[PDB]
Amino acid sequence: KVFGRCELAAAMKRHGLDNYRGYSLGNWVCAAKFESNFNTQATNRNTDGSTDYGILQINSRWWCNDGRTPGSRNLCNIPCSALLSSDITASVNCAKKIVSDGNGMNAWVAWRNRCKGTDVQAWIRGCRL
């Protein structure tokens, strides 16, 4: 599924991400934009043998089981395939754990490079939330 911008913002707000750990909704929409371009099916294989899955590009070394990543630890207790769903619930629930893991949103490389320190409120422009 490819979400519209405001569509995703409303879904993220429904799932409690607005101001979660002090990160405004715009931060989360910006992260998704540059991690996956709002595509739930996005996947990216890393050189280290892990893969990043779904709308928030969650990594298979630590967070989900894809059964092909050496030394993996499945800390969200889900198959990585669950992160490729149309429903963002599993991704959001796992993202709440990640953002609490001692690095804030710096866990998402694209957020750090393209969102951090910017006017992220622009990402919810036009949205009726």
From Swiss-Prot:
Keyword set includes Ubl conjugation: no
User: What keywords appear on the UniProt entry?
Assistant: Allergen, Antimicrobial, Bacteriolytic enzyme, Disulfide bond, Glycosidase, Hydrolase, Secreted, Signal
Tissues expressing this chain = In the egg white and polymorphonuclear leukocytes.
Is Disulfide bond given among the entry's keywords?
yes
What EC number(s) does the entry state? 3.2.1.17
Q: Which Pfam families does the record match to this protein?
A: Lys
Q: Where in the cell is it found?
A: Secreted
**SS bond list:** 6-127, 30-115, 64-80, 76-94
Q: Where is the C-type lysozyme domain?
A: 1-129
Q: What is its main location?
A: secreted
Q: SMART domains, from UniProt?
A: LYZ1
A Gene Ontology biological process in which this protein takes part is: cell wall macromolecule catabolic process
Q: What class of enzyme is it?
A: hydrolase
Q: Catalytic site residues?
A: 35, 52
Q: Report which reactions are catalysed by this protein.
A: Hydrolysis of (1->4)-beta-linkages between N-acetylmuramic acid and N-acetyl-D-glucosamine residues in a peptidoglycan and between N-acetyl-D-glucosamine residues in chitodextrins
GO cellular component terms given for this protein: cytoplasm; endoplasmic reticulum; extracellular space
Q: Which residues make up the binding site for substrate?
A: 101
Molecular function GO terms recorded: beta-N-acetylglucosaminidase activity; identical protein binding; lysozyme activity
PROSITE patterns recorded for this chain?
GLYCOSYL_HYDROL_F22_1 (PS00128), GLYCOSYL_HYDROL_F22_2 (PS51348)
**Other comment:** Lysozyme C is capable of both hydrolysis and transglycosylation; it also shows a slight esterase activity. It acts rapidly on both peptide-substituted and unsubstituted peptidoglycan, and slowly on chitin oligosaccharides.
Q: Per its database record, what is this protein's job?
A: Lysozymes have primarily a bacteriolytic function; those in tissues and body fluids are associated with the monocyte-macrophage system and enhance the activity of immunoagents. Has bacteriolytic activity against M.luteus.
Protein family per UniProt: Belongs to the glycosyl hydrolase 22 family.
Whom does it interact with, and what assembly results?
Answer: Monomer.
Query: What name appears for this protein in its UniProt entry?
Result: Lysozyme C
Say which species the protein is native to. Gallus gallus (Chicken)
Gene name linked to the record: LYZ
